[PDB]
Design a protein around this ligand. Structure first.
Ligand SMILES: [Ca+2]
Ligand SMILES: [Ca+2]
Ligand SMILES: [Ca+2]
Ligand SMILES: [Ca+2]
Ligand SMILES: [Ca+2]
Ligand SMILES: [Ca+2]
Ligand SMILES: [Ca+2]
Ligand SMILES: [Zn+2]
Lengths: 318, 65
């Protein structure tokens, strides 16, 4: 194992300075990552893997074997959120957050919308298979439940289907923050599900703060997505690009916001909307504390700007 | 056979109805009124004809980004 380095993207989103307050290791907080699966014994990820599930072929399996990453993309994404702060490898935006790895993409990195919908349902239900055990309407942030608080989707397609949208709505109503990649075709607007109003569409910047030529336009926010070093199978590391690598930076930031808020106040913040510019919701905070690049204000390249954890957490707590 | 996802009216739907048109249930959602089903390609019209079926959608493809 190589000595630990902090990848430029983790630096750029201002995560390291948040770690004295929280690294996301608040018990009620889980991040669900719907992707190719995970190298579940990777030394730099294992301790943060709380649940491994697969929805491939409409069959829900928690057999490790069926949940393992056979592509690598998922392992990389997960590493960007939650690689462990230690002496090896890399480090995530939220290096102590619990991860739910929900495998909705197969070896080829392609997936059915049906499987992905099922995947969102599983992030909501949690290991116990029940959304709201005690029946009080609180799901995300309810310590009595095991739902994830963040759903991270580094994937997309061109189709807008009603059942998948209805499941997205269910997640939002459960109080879950939904984050997705804008797409990698240099298109005028985001793929689905990033283009739904309930979801945070994320574009990719490179290391000189320019927007990637491949990044689908009109995102909500943007994040490091070119030359991003992270964990990769088997028990190794690799450097990749895409709006897929940006997405987890944002999910990490959200995790830290919700974790810091719950730690101080024993509650989480509402999810919020796109137009939100208050300090009273997750998305509002993300928007007002984003590094505003390009033209003043929201713009078609960067969205509201580059997410900044240090500032988002300060705004949440104050 | 194709895989499709049907949006259903729970007041008229029963998973056992699918077998009648040659199909089988793959997954019943717990949180929305929809079912994933496999059916013969020439059975799509019959599903549509079912009073419990409000919408039939094809299973689309997403890719890693
Ligand atoms: Ca939770
Ligand atoms: Ca590490
Ligand atoms: Ca549950
Ligand atoms: Ca509850
Ligand atoms: Ca409760
Ligand atoms: Ca391994
Ligand atoms: Ca701007
Ligand atoms: Zn079948």
């Amino acid at each position: 194992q190589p000595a630990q380095t902090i990848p430029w993207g983790i630096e750029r989103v201002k995560a390291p300075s948040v770690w004295s307050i929280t690294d996301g290791s608040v018990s009620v907080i889980q991040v669900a990552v719907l992707d190719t699966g995970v190298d579940y014994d990777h030394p730099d990820l294992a301790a943060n893997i709380a649940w491994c599930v697969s929805t491939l072929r409409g069959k829900v399996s928690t057999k490790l074997r069926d949940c393992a990453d056979q592509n690598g993309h998922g392992t990389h994404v997960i590493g960007t959120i939650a690689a462990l702060n230690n002496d090896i490898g890399v480090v995530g935006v939220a290096p102590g957050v619990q991860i739910y790895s929900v495998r909705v993409l197969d070896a080829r990195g392609s997936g059915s919308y049906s499987d992905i919908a099922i995947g969102i349902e599983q992030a909501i239900l949690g290991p116990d298979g029940v959304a709201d055990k005690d029946g009080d309407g609180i799901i995300a942030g309810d310590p009595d439940d095991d739902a994830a608080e963040v759903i991270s989707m580094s994937l997309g397609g061109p189709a807008d289907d009603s059942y998948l949208y209805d499941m997205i709505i269910q997640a939002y109503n459960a109080g879950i923050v939904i984050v997705a990649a804008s797409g990698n075709e240099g298109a005028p607007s985001p793929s689905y599900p990033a283009a739904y109003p309930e979801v945070i569409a994320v574009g990719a910047i490179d290391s000189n703060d320019n927007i990637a030529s491949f990044s689908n336009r009109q995102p909500e926010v943007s994040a490091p997505g070119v030359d991003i070093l992270s964990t990769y199978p088997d028990d190794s590391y690799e450097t990749l690009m895409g709006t897929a690598m940006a997405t987890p930076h944002v999910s990490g930031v959200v995790a830290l916001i919700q974790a810091a808020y719950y730690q101080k106040y024993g509650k989480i913040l509402p999810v919020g909307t796109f137009d939100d510019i208050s300090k009273n919701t997750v998305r509002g905070i993300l928007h007002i504390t984003a590094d505003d690049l390009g033209p003043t204000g929201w713009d078609a390249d960067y969205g509201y700007g580059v997410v900044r954890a240090a500032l988002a957490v300060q705004a949440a707590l104050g | 056979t194709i895989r499709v996802i049907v949006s259903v009216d729970k007041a008229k739907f029963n998973p056992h109805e699918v077998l009648g048109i040659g199909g089988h249930i793959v997954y019943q959602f717990k949180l929305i009124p929809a079912v994933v089903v496999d059916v013969p390609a020439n059975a799509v019209g019959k599903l549509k004809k079912m009073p419990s079926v409000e919408k039939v959608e094809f299973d689309h493809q997403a890719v890693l980004l």
